[PDB]
Amino acid sequence: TTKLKTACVTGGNGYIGSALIKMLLEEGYAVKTTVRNPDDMEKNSHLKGLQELGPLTVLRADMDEEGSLDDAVAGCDYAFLVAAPVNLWAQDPEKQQIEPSVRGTLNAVRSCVKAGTVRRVILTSSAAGVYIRPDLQGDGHALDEDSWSDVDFLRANKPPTWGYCVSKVLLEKAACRFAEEHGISLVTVCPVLTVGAAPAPKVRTSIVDSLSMLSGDEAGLAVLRGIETTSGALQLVHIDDLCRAELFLAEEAAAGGRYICCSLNTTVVELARFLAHKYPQYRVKTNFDDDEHLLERPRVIMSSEKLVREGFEYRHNTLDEIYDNVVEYGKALGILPY
Numbered sequence: 001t002t003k004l005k006t007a008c009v010t011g012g013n014g015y016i017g018s019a020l021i022k023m024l025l026e027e028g029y030a031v032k033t034t035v036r037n038p039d040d041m042e043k044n045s046h047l048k049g050l051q052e053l054g055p056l057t058v059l060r061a062d063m064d065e066e067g068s069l070d071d072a073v074a075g076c077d078y079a080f081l082v083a084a085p086v087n088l089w090a091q092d093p094e095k096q097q098i099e100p101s102v103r104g105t106l107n108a109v110r111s112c113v114k115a116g117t118v119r120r121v122i123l124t125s126s127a128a129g130v131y132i133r134p135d136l137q138g139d140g141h142a143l144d145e146d147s148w149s150d151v152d153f154l155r156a157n158k159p160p161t162w163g164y165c166v167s168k169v170l171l172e173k174a175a176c177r178f179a180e181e182h183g184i185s186l187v188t189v190c191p192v193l194t195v196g197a198a199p200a201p202k203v204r205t206s207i208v209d210s211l212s213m214l215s216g217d218e219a220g221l222a223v224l225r226g227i228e229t230t231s232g233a234l235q236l237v238h239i240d241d242l243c244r245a246e247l248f249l250a251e252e253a254a255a256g257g258r259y260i261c262c263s264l265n266t267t268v269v270e271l272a273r274f275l276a277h278k279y280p281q282y283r284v285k286t287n288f289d290d291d292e293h294l295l296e297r298p299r300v301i302m303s304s305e306k307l308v309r310e311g312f313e314y315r316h317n318t319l320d321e322i323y324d325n326v327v328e329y330g331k332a333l334g335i336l337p338y
Ligand SMILES: NC(=O)c1ccc[n+]([C@@H]2O[C@H](COP(=O)([O-])OP(=O)(O)OC[C@H]3O[C@@H](n4cnc5c(N)ncnc54)[C@H](OP(=O)(O)O)[C@@H]3O)[C@@H](O)[C@H]2O)c1
Pocket: 010, 011, 012, 013, 014, 015, 016, 017, 035, 036, 037, 043, 061, 062, 063, 064, 082, 083, 084, 085, 086, 104, 124, 125, 126, 127, 190, 191, 192, 193, 194, 195, 203, 204, 205, 206, 207
């Protein structure tokens, strides 16, 4: 295995990071991953099991420190920059979310350039960097990769989680400029809300949100309603499709630039009705007192046509397929009581 191609994944305890590591190993890569405390078995108890699937090395790094990633990405052919600050409700988002995001990403791409061996960097951003579009009124809109969240609007109005949206715009733009300056291929993936089982033992993130209609977690339900209100739809993708898309964009020489990753555009009401029918053993609310905001169908959709025309195909295309295994994960995590 000395001549295996080697992938770096930052944040191996994270939801997406853990799933990506598993896929990379299953597909025959050697992997190096960073976590902030490899001795923390509450967060990292899954890494020993993943080491049974293929060659996996675990390194200690905090991406906020310059040069922290140097050792882990040395010798790697691909770098998957998944880890990032995810402080949605920071009291001081400029200093606690936006600047750490930009600085953490430039730190990481700098390490990738320094390694000299990295053929491509795959940056995981978010749809939150795409869909804040207050200029679009009425329905019938489709967003593509040239849609950028309106940073001036976000900073002027500071709606909840605005700092997260802004951080994605700024880190993406900085990463792109830096990578062009240094002649390193960087492809950015902007996934929508991601659903499904992963190896990580202690995650919340989109599992809390995508299960909130079954759990009754009002914070998660507010995240779903917020996505719909601010973006014009409730968009979903299965973790397996996201991970396949990341490997595809790493491997496909002709791929370049930014890619939305999104399987389905739905709504709060459609999702609740679907879950109430599929999982009636949970108490799912489906009768909504208007809440005006609640759409009857998407007013703005996220288009994944760029990725699909590159040659990629989603495998989880219906709500049943997108929710094929997340409930068992939620139970295993204790997000769901039974
Ligand atoms: N889940 C979704 O629906 C979704 C959708 C679109 C985009 N994303 C993005 O995908 C990325 C992964 O998020 P996730 O959903 O998998 O959430 P998560 O489970 O909360 O994972 C976040 C990861 O980032 C790490 N991290 C944060 N700050 C770090 C730092 N300074 N140094 C090193 N690691 C740091 C975390 O490590 P610690 O535990 O040590 O903090 C953890 O590994 C995020 O950038 C998110 O914006 C997620």
